[PDB]
Amino acid sequence: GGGKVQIINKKLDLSNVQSKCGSKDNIKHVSGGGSVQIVYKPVDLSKVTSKCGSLGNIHHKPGGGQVEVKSEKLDFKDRVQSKIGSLDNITHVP
Amino acid sequence: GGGKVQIINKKLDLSNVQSKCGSKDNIKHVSGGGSVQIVYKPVDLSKVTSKCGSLGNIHHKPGGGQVEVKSEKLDFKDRVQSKIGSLDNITHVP
Amino acid sequence: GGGKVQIINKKLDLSNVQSKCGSKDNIKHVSGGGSVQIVYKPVDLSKVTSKCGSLGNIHHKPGGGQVEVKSEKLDFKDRVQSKIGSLDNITHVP
């Protein structure tokens, strides 16, 4: 009869991290220092008129809509340890 | 008869982190220093008129609608330990 | 009967990190120092008119919509250890 000692330390990380971002989009970021006119899909006798006069001390600084998609998995100071002080395995079979 | 000692320390992380962001969108961020005119899908004799006069000391700083999608899984100072002080496994089979 | 001692320290990292970003888009970032006119898919007798006069001290600094997609998996100070102080394996079979 032999004395068996077994110690095991496993760590499996089955990780799947994804970050998808689709956009079917029209027009989006349109910016005009003076007048801006937008006409989406006019039909038949669709009269659209804009009038504007003079253009003086104008500041126009559009900061816009930032889109951000993220997906993180983080392990900070993870530890899987096994401290076996003073191990001994004696077999004595006369 | 052999003395068996077994120690096991496992840690399985079956993780799935996702972050999806779709947008089917029209027009979105439209900015005009003077007049802005938008006409979506006019039909038949749809008269639309805008008039504006003069343009002086104008500031126009549109900060807009930021979109953010996130998905985190974090493990801070995780610990799976097994402290076995002074282990001993003796077999004595005359 | 022989005394067996076994120590195992495994660490499996089955990782899958992805970051997809599609965009079927029209027009997007359009910027005009004076007037901006956009007409999407006009049909039939779709009269669209814009008028503007004069263009003075104009600043026009469009900061726009930054899109960012990210996906991180990070392991900071990960540790899978096995400290076996003073190991001994004696076999005594007269």
Numbering used by the authors:
A (entry chain A), B (entry chain B), C (entry chain C): 271 to 364
Sentences from the paper on this structure:
The filament core from the cerebral cortex of 48-week-old mice from line PS19 extends from residues G271-P364 of tau and consists of the C-terminal four residues of R1, the whole of R2 and R3 and 28 N-terminal residues of R4. Its secondary structure comprises eight β﻿-strands that range from 3 to 23 residues in length. The four-layered ‘head’, which is made of β﻿2-β﻿5, consists of the nine C-terminal residues of R2 and the whole of R3. The ‘tail’ is two-layered, with one layer consisting of β﻿1 that is made of the rest of R2 and a small portion of R1, whereas the other layer consists of β﻿6-β﻿8 and is formed by 28 residues of R4. Similar to filaments from line Tg2541, tau filaments from the brains of PS19 mice contain putative non-proteinaceous cofactors and/or post-translational modifications. A large external density is found next to K290 and the adjacent Q288. In the PS19 fold, these lysine residues are located on different sides of the main chain, with K298 making a salt bridge with D295 that turns the preceding N-terminal residues in a different direction. K281, K317 and K321 co-ordinate the second additional density in the Tg2541 fold; it makes a right angle turn between strands β﻿1 and bβ﻿, whereas in the PS19 fold, K281 is in the middle of the long β﻿1 strand, where it is buried alongside D283, K343, D345 and D348, in the interface with R4 strands β﻿6 and β﻿7. The secondary structure of segment R4 of the PS19 fold is consistent with the β﻿-hairpin that we propose to account for either island of the Tg2541 fold.
Mice transgenic for human mutant P301S tau are widely used as models for human tauopathies. They develop neurodegeneration and abundant filamentous inclusions made of human mutant four-repeat tau. Here we report the electron cryo-microscopy (cryo-EM) structures of tau filaments from the brains of Tg2541 and PS19 mice transgenic for human P301S tau. However, the structures of tau filaments from mouse lines Tg2541 and PS19 share a substructure at the junction of R2 and R3, which comprises residues I297-V312.
